[PDB]
Automatic annotation (TrEMBL), chains A, B, C:
Organism annotation: Streptococcus mutans serotype c (strain ATCC 700610 / UA159)
UniProt name for this protein: Translation initiation inhibitor aldR regulator-like protein
PANTHER family hit by this protein: 2-IMINOBUTANOATE/2-IMINOPROPANOATE DEAMINASE RIDA, 2-IMINOBUTANOATE_2-IMINOPROPANOATE DEAMINASE
Coiled-coil region(s): none
Pfam families assigned to the protein according to its UniProt record, in alphabetical order: Ribonuc_L-PSP
GO cellular component assignments: cytosol
InterPro entries with a match to the protein in the record: RidA, RidA_CS, RutC-like_sf, YjgF/YER057c/UK114
Recorded GO MF terms: deaminase activity
Family to which this protein belongs: Belongs to the RutC family.
Length: 124, 124, 124
């Protein structure tokens, strides 16, 4: 069972936005792309993370879950040095019950954005 | 329970090719190695991805699942400029049913291969 | 349910050390930090891997599982050429029932450490 919403960038190619197995939602890595203009939103890790989170949120909602039910994320950064500012904006979506996390510096990301996040979540 | 198949490269030392928990298969990242010669097959992203996918296929079969029942993949490229041909070959293992995906360039993979793909798949 | 133990590095901020969902513990990736001092432990891939493994131990223990019941790990190395020494240390924790694995070289890790391991595990 699959996720489609026009409130996050559309799956163009051989994947979906996310997919559900039992109570678990596995989302595709989200990037700082606008679901409206398809452009990269923002020029800073701060702006870009906010976009990524907007995009994740849309996916959780359409799946009938929420930020507070994310059990685990993997954060991909282009520059581990962004980590502090990155963290401040991450924390605006997850404020209370926190997910388990890994955060590493990869070499490149689609479009050389600064941040890509994937999330795994429990259904409400 | 573990998974072993002669049709994917042999698991040497402290891992297995795949492990099942409840209804879920967590397969190890597959590289374009020949289960029969123990060597890297292919000189292009195209050939290499082909072998990765065979390797993965063997494991799913062994595990009582298939590509249509793969829920989430992670595709680690040695070079994101290879993305377009990767994505064309990747598509051919699927039909209308796609998994959630992330795909990133990592700095290096075992034996300097171009592609490594981990899957998580639901058991039929 | 969130996991916390004093015997793994403390969760500074907007993650937790481990999160349970159904029968699954998803632990934050672990680095070679001392829970007592907060510093990097080890200069070699061997000593750092040991520290990581203890941090994992404390978490599995806290959650009421152990190494035998780990389904899948991801090993982020800063240098793939470290693989053999790291594999050997990696072995000392996993006796009989090995998890699936993926191992890739990232550009960079927090604090410029050589190794970070995330684990997924079933509750005894």
């Amino acid at each position: 069972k699959k996720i489609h919403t026009d409130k996050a960038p559309a799956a163009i190619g051989p994947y979906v936005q996310g997919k559900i197995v039992g109570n678990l939602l596995f989302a595709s890595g989200q990037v700082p792309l606008s679901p409206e203009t398809g452009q990269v939103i923002g020029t800073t890790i701060e702006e870009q993370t906010q976009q990524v989170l907007k995009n994740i949120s849309a996916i959780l909602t359409e799946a009938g879950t929420d930020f507070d039910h994310v059990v685990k994320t993997t954060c991909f950064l282009s520059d581990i040095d962004d980590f502090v500012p990155f963290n401040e904006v991450y924390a605006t979506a997850f404020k209370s019950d926190f997910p388990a996390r890994s955060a590493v510096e990869v070499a490149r990301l689609p479009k050389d954005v600064k941040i890509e996040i994937e999330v795994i979540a429990e259904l409400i």
